[PDB]
């Protein structure tokens, strides 16, 4: 998995999938839960985004698998995806963290 996750075409595909998880996943009630987390992230000027592993096991579950198998490469992508997911909402949040 270490060698798979680091190949450039694979890395790009993983990023887009993780992006699409945060953008398109919605709660049992129908609210965008990761929109509500990103609001709270940028208002608090918090540097840390909580993600629930069950929300990956319930959608795009290969990402939940790679995340358990080799997190040191997977989180290294999902930190950049979370930066871009919050920067869609708060342009220039890069000047804050």
């Amino acid at each position: 998995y270490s060698e798979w996750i680091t190949q450039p075409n694979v890395s790009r595909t993983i990023a887009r999938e993780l992006k699409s998880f945060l953008l398109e996943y919605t709660d049992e009630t129908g609210r965008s839960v990761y929109g509500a987390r990103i609001r709270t992230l940028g208002e608090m000027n918090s540097e840390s985004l909580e993600v629930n592993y069950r929300h990956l096991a319930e959608s795009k579950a290969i990402l939940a698998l790679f995340l358990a198998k080799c997190p040191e490469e997977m989180l290294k992508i999902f930190d950049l995806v979370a930066m871009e997911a919050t920067e869609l909402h708060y342009p220039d949040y890069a000047r804050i963290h």
Partner: protein, 564 residues
Amino acid sequence: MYYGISQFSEAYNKILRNSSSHSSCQLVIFVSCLNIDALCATKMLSLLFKKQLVQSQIVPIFGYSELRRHYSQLDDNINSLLLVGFGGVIDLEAFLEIDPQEYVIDTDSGEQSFRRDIYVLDAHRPWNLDNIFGSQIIQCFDDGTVDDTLGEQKEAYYKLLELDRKQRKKQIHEYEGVLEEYYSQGTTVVNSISAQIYSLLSAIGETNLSNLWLNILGTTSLDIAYAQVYNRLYPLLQDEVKRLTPSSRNSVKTPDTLTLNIQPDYYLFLLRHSSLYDSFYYSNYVNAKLSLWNENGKKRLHKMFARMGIPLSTAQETWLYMDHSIKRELGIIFDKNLDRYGLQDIIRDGFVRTLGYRGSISASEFVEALTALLEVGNNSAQKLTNLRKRWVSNFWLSWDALDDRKVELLNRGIQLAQDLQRAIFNTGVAILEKKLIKHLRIYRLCVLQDGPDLDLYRNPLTLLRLGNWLIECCAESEDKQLLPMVLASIDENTDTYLVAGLTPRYPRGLDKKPILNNFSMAFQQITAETDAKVRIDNFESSIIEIRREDLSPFLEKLTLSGLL
């Protein structure tokens, strides 16, 4: 009419002729304290009489009861009076108990002269006709109102004064009908008293940057409540700053350079003297657009700073120590972002003074400091009088803070203004959270029964800070009908409520003919009808005091009143 704008030099030369001698003090200026425009007017007018060596006395006055007391005890050698900021709307000849026959001298010839002149420098309307036409001792100054607006009242006044049956019935009730429509107009301020005295300094040829700064300060104090008047006068102030500013540009800063620029002066609370966060949090206008009392409004504020790209930890730095890149980029950050929140109107150009190396103050920030000095700078007849003495004593703190030698007293003021606006806000949220504004169809009622540091709101100005905060808050909400508002606050020691009647106003960017404060009639007419105990003695006659148990009977007859 009485002294039009064309002929202020004649009224001034008449003061010099009558009241200049090296022998004695002969000139008295009565100034309404609790008015910044009357303060800045009287400061200019004292620097003028200093330069002419006219020996003079300035007496600050709280209200009409003290005007009668101080007038009653004037030494008979005093032969000119200036009434700065009051008395245009009362019959001064009746109120002061003048009979001109006890004042007339040298009656010969189609002629009179008098042992005293009473010059009224006042911006309030509707003018009392027995001052403007009906007296030779009282001598009003005008912006132009009388010739432009009063021609039908002039004619009606004289045809009724001459006429001491069909041909009579047909006419006496036409002319009384014109006066009866002229009264039954609400109160308004239509000019700054300082721009009147600056136009007198322009007639004498005395203008300089010190008198121009006092003109800018006096006129800026109107912007909160009479925005329609500030916008008439603002174009005329821009021209005078250009006229008096010296030739040099790309100038080196030196301890001696005063610069009085026209530059961006954002509509924010004490920006240069506070953080960038407190500037938004305590601004009347911002609070009104974001609904910033409740915690979702506070989220909208953080969500804005995050979107502007300013860390909260930077936004909360004191503006001097906040970093050099943000402070020059800020014009671009606001021109990009404020539009999203509708805050676009915060962008404004204003007057900014900097002296030497001591760092800039805007005219907006300086009047916030000067008002905070009037408000908090330091057996019921003793309990009132030892309080009104305090408000006369505070006038000299605001006065001394107009001097450049006394910046430490301005810096007291700039700290006190931030203590007040925090207390206004912490009270204004209590009113909106606890739903204390009751809708009474004809008007909105608010009554502060109890609360933290409630003993501030017994000063008429501090009650008007909270009034102007609750008005901005309502005036921007698109669903509310515009209605007059009554704001009452208890003093637990005197056992009265201080009651203020407030005009609503249009939202701060919309661009109509003015609306007028008719509580000044409704309170008098209900007072005359009732046996209740009240005080109707304040110069801003929208403000009254009433004993605790009489208030509910008073409001009960206010809702019936057709005068609002």
